[PDB]
Amino acid sequence: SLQGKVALVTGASRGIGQAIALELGRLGAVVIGTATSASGAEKIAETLKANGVEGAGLVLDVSSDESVAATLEHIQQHLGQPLIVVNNAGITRDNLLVRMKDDEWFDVVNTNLNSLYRLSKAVLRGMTKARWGRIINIGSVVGAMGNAGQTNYAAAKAGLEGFTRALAREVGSRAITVNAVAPGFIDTDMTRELPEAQREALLGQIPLGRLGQAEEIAKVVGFLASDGAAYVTGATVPVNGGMYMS
Amino acid sequence: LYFQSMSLQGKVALVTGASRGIGQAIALELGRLGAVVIGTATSASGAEKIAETLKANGVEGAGLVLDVSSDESVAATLEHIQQHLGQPLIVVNNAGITRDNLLVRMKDDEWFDVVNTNLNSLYRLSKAVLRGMTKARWGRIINIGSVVGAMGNAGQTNYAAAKAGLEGFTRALAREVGSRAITVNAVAPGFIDTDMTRELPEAQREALLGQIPLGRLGQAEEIAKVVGFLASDGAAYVTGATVPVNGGMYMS
Amino acid sequence: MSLQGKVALVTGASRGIGQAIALELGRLGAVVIGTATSASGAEKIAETLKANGVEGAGLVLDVSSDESVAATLEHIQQHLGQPLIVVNNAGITRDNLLVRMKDDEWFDVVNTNLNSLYRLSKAVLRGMTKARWGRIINIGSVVGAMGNAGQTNYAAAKAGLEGFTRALAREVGSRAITVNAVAPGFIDTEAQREALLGQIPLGRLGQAEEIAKVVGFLASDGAAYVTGATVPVNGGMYMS
Amino acid sequence: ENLYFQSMSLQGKVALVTGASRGIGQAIALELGRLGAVVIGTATSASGAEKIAETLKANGVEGAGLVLDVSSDESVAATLEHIQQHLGQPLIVVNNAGITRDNLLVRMKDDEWFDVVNTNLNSLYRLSKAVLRGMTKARWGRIINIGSVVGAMGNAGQTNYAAAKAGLEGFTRALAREVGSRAITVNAVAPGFIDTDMTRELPEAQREALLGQIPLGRLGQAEEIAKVVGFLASDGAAYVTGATVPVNGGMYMS
Numbered sequence A: 001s002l003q004g005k006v007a008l009v010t011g012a013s014r015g016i017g018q019a020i021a022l023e024l025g026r027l028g029a030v031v032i033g034t035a036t037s038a039s040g041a042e043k044i045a046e047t048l049k050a051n052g053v054e055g056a057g058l059v060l061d062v063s064s065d066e067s068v069a070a071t072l073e074h075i076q077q078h079l080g081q082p083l084i085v086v087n088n089a090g091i092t093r094d095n096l097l098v099r100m101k102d103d104e105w106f107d108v109v110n111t112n113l114n115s116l117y118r119l120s121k122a123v124l125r126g127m128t129k130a131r132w133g134r135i136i137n138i139g140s141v142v143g144a145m146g147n148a149g150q151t152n153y154a155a156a157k158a159g160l161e162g163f164t165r166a167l168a169r170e171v172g173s174r175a176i177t178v179n180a181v182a183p184g185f186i187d188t189d190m191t192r193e194l195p196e197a198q199r200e201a202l203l204g205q206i207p208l209g210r211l212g213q214a215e216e217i218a219k220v221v222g223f224l225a226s227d228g229a230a231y232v233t234g235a236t237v238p239v240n241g242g243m244y245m246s
Numbered sequence B: 001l002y003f004q005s006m007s008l009q010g011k012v013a014l015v016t017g018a019s020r021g022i023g024q025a026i027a028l029e030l031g032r033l034g035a036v037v038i039g040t041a042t043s044a045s046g047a048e049k050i051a052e053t054l055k056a057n058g059v060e061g062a063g064l065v066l067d068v069s070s071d072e073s074v075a076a077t078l079e080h081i082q083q084h085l086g087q088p089l090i091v092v093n094n095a096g097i098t099r100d101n102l103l104v105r106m107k108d109d110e111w112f113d114v115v116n117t118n119l120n121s122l123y124r125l126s127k128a129v130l131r132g133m134t135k136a137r138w139g140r141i142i143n144i145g146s147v148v149g150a151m152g153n154a155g156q157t158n159y160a161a162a163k164a165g166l167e168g169f170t171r172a173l174a175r176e177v178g179s180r181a182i183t184v185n186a187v188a189p190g191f192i193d194t195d196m197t198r199e200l201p202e203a204q205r206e207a208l209l210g211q212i213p214l215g216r217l218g219q220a221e222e223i224a225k226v227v228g229f230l231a232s233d234g235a236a237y238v239t240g241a242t243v244p245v246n247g248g249m250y251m252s
Numbered sequence C: 001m002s003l004q005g006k007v008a009l010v011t012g013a014s015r016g017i018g019q020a021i022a023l024e025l026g027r028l029g030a031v032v033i034g035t036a037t038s039a040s041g042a043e044k045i046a047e048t049l050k051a052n053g054v055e056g057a058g059l060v061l062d063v064s065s066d067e068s069v070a071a072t073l074e075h076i077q078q079h080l081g082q083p084l085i086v087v088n089n090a091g092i093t094r095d096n097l098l099v100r101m102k103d104d105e106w107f108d109v110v111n112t113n114l115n116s117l118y119r120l121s122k123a124v125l126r127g128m129t130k131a132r133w134g135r136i137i138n139i140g141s142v143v144g145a146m147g148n149a150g151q152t153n154y155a156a157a158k159a160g161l162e163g164f165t166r167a168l169a170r171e172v173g174s175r176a177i178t179v180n181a182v183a184p185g186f187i188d189t190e191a192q193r194e195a196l197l198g199q200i201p202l203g204r205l206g207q208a209e210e211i212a213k214v215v216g217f218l219a220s221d222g223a224a225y226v227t228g229a230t231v232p233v234n235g236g237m238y239m240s
Numbered sequence D: 001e002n003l004y005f006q007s008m009s010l011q012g013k014v015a016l017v018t019g020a021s022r023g024i025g026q027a028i029a030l031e032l033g034r035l036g037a038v039v040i041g042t043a044t045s046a047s048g049a050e051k052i053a054e055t056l057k058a059n060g061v062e063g064a065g066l067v068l069d070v071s072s073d074e075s076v077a078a079t080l081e082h083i084q085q086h087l088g089q090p091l092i093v094v095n096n097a098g099i100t101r102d103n104l105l106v107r108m109k110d111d112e113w114f115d116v117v118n119t120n121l122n123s124l125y126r127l128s129k130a131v132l133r134g135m136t137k138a139r140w141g142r143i144i145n146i147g148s149v150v151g152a153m154g155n156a157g158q159t160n161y162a163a164a165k166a167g168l169e170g171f172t173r174a175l176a177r178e179v180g181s182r183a184i185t186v187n188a189v190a191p192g193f194i195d196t197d198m199t200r201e202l203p204e205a206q207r208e209a210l211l212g213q214i215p216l217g218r219l220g221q222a223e224e225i226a227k228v229v230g231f232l233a234s235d236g237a238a239y240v241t242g243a244t245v246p247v248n249g250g251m252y253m254s
């Protein structure tokens, strides 16, 4: 369903990004997955190979103006034009607002929201020239719902959806779609961090009565990347097991 | 010639209003994904034409008569399905009508027929199928809404009330049934090239394109792809959601 | 005050939220016609308004009946005057899991809570259009946006109310009539109680008067640029 | 001196309104003042701060005009310290200051992206952090953030503004969850298209097209946003928190 397309997936070394990279690969995409370190990029390349997926690893820091512009320029001139871009990379730095350090606020906004500008800007010319593209941004239920101790993360993740909607309006006439996928609580390193009794508490808020799997997010992203999703744009697709319904 | 099993292999799926338009495309897509597909029409001739369409496309299933506005018709048809093909584990509530008018000009029948066909049908169909899904510990209910539910539209207070009600229904039922691994979701199309949109005045359809970032009406196949995805186990963690499929005409 | 000279019609005004809405519009200077299903309720409305120094009347009204509404409003508009503020608040619940739900439980909630909007709105729009001013305010529920197990009928009706609100707002805006919804959370009208409060950031149930204050504001000239809105009044239980 | 008026809904509350020198923030400062608040309004220039002071005085409102740049960590720190040391502890805070730097994303310069997020979104962290301890000690507060219909709707040419304004709502909801137990509400108001300098800058052809999208068939007035903010600041809205109230003439309905 994606044969002949190049996909770029940011944050593909583990968790949701890794499942996304493998799923797009399963669909026939050549996959460029990113990590913040050389060894991470090397491991991505090997993991894709181990799964029979063609592609490469890329060292990328989406919080850095230079790391994005320079690395994307290189790939587009020398290797090829990504027509599917999944902005998956993201971090949390939680604290009540009165206890939150300046770096905790700015690092989350800069990594999780400003990254969308850096990546999208680097890839849009190729998509507009091809008259085809998919930009898929990984948001969070916390964007719609809010969560105490996460004003920075809620701000960035809600901002991600606003970005999604406005860009979908700019590029729709060139058959590029822009969508968000907002996971609920998914079994990854990010969630394994939370204290035990808080995870037991989260389950009581979820109608399906379980955490989600990274593969479940990846399936949804794989669908949006496909031709069958061509009339879906500016949407946020919640994948949260019923934790939040809007 | 033994093909590979597809994502819905062997599941019995019921699609209301599969005689034409979005419902027909949904029926064919679920059939492509390996479901046994029962599609319905409001007349015997429509039911026969569904059976012919399924066979021409190599889909196992049946065409049946169903009027979702009628308690007696839902009961009779669902009894027949349970007896002759089995209990549906995928149900797509697609049947719907419009009876447009400004509220001050609206006739009682225009209000009540739209609420009764588009909203009360969700109670009739879901009540009939839920016990089978709960016993199987798996199910998919997918309700076809409309952008008009979220956005509103002049001349469509009846339709907007019904289609927004469909989303409230979807969210509440998702909460009742999640613990049995049944998901309940809505898909809200924008403006799709079907008989329904082709009914609107020419000048209105052209003004419509200017509001849609993609610059075109959607195709029925584009809604059907989304529904086929939600029916699969790839969408098992999606419940109580409304997925807009409107070409960016409305973003929420 | 801000509503002096206007007639307001408030359905379901015999207690709770509807009563508080009636009193608030009254305190703002409206002449208030509050409705009830029974003679006892209608007489209670009249007495309560009087006791609070509000001018108005009680009216027997069955919002589920095409005839009761159409006739009873035609009467008011020909003898008492023209309601320019209309609050649709009359509402019922019939709770049950969908698999256990009886036909009457589904249909009575949709007919009373949703179809009533059509009956009342149809009856009052001519007077508002002539006046070139109006307020229609529909009382929904957090259950509309959030869903609740055991209340598929109520959630359908109350979400339907918001869709009706937005579509009607589009129809009538050119005449300076606004149409809005207010969605209360859990309002004060002992183990599951502490569980419920844990879902509410403010940590308390709402007061009926807190809903009425929001309705009062939407009714005023200050809310003239608000239309097609749903205002949640739920202590942060649900955020949209 | 001999005339005593009735106390109003915000009587004696210290309020801070960022960007009160014109437009919506000016209307808001005057509305809060009419409601009995002591009003501190801010501008980015000494001239604008003087204009605020004079507008308040002409309207018989007690308060002050001050210079504040909400994009600057140092300006926010020093101004909020000055306010606490000599004016009062703001219990009502309206984050109204905001800008646009429009361009298609492919033509957008880095400074246009960053200035909009930094002015319109990062300002919420700067201001809220500076005022919360005062509200938590009083066990009462109101934070009211001025968003935009563009946050929910999106708009071509405004990816930066849409991201900032949608982020503002996410911030609102999360902060409302944190502070609710101290009876501090946090809400957003999302104007549509209001007759101010920001909208008057759009070309005439684009403004006339806008009117075709608005059911009420007119732009809103700054005073119409101010009335809504003044209500949310009152105890009449004590049970509303984490809400976004759209004030857009029906242009966008969510």
Ligand SMILES: NC(=O)C1=CN([C@@H]2O[C@H](COP(=O)(O)OP(=O)(O)OC[C@H]3O[C@@H](n4cnc5c(N)ncnc54)[C@H](OP(=O)(O)O)[C@@H]3O)[C@@H](O)[C@H]2O)C=CC1
Residues within 6 Å of the ligand: A010, A011, A012, A013, A014, A015, A016, A017, A034, A035, A036, A037, A040, A060, A061, A062, A063, A088, A089, A090, A091, A111, A138, A139, A140, A141, A182, A183, A184, A185, A186, A187, A188, A189, A190, A191
């Ligand atoms: N897990 C969950 O329950 C939820 C997750 N999400 C969102 O899903 C996305 C992935 O989450 P999850 O898989 O849990 O996260 P993990 O923390 O497991 O993985 C984070 C990934 O992002 C990469 N990354 C982090 N910072 C940067 C950066 N500055 N530049 C480039 N890459 C970076 C990491 O690279 P490396 O390995 O080099 O560090 C890694 O691949 C995130 O956007 C998260 O916010 C949303 C809702 C719920």
Ligand SMILES: NC(=O)C1=CN([C@@H]2O[C@H](COP(=O)(O)OP(=O)(O)OC[C@H]3O[C@@H](n4cnc5c(N)ncnc54)[C@H](OP(=O)(O)O)[C@@H]3O)[C@@H](O)[C@H]2O)C=CC1
Residues within 6 Å of the ligand: B016, B017, B018, B019, B020, B021, B022, B023, B040, B041, B042, B043, B046, B066, B067, B068, B069, B094, B095, B096, B097, B117, B144, B145, B146, B147, B188, B189, B190, B191, B192, B193, B194, B195, B196, B197
């Ligand atoms: N087309 C569009 O742009 C949009 C469509 N939708 C929704 O998508 C769904 C299908 O729309 P579309 O394909 O355009 O519609 P069509 O009018 O083309 O087809 C309607 C289908 O529903 C059936 N139907 C009508 N009334 C009943 C009834 N009482 N009981 C059972 N079946 C009935 C019809 O059967 P028969 O052939 O016997 O008449 C037909 O199969 C509807 O719910 C519609 O509201 C939502 C948004 C936009």
Ligand SMILES: NC(=O)C1=CN([C@@H]2O[C@H](COP(=O)(O)OP(=O)(O)OC[C@H]3O[C@@H](n4cnc5c(N)ncnc54)[C@H](OP(=O)(O)O)[C@@H]3O)[C@@H](O)[C@H]2O)C=CC1
Residues within 6 Å of the ligand: D018, D019, D020, D021, D022, D023, D024, D025, D042, D043, D044, D045, D048, D068, D069, D070, D071, D096, D097, D098, D099, D119, D146, D147, D148, D149, D190, D191, D192, D193, D194, D195, D196, D197, D198, D199
């Ligand atoms: N007008 C409209 O249709 C809409 C407006 N809005 C939002 O409403 C708010 C008010 O807008 P509006 O009145 O139209 O805008 P104007 O541009 O007319 O006024 C903006 C105000 O913000 C102040 N300001 C700008 N930058 C800063 C800064 N860095 N630090 C401190 N103050 C600053 C300005 O100060 P000074 O006078 O010194 O320049 C001015 O008082 C903004 O957040 C805007 O995004 C949202 C939707 C629609």
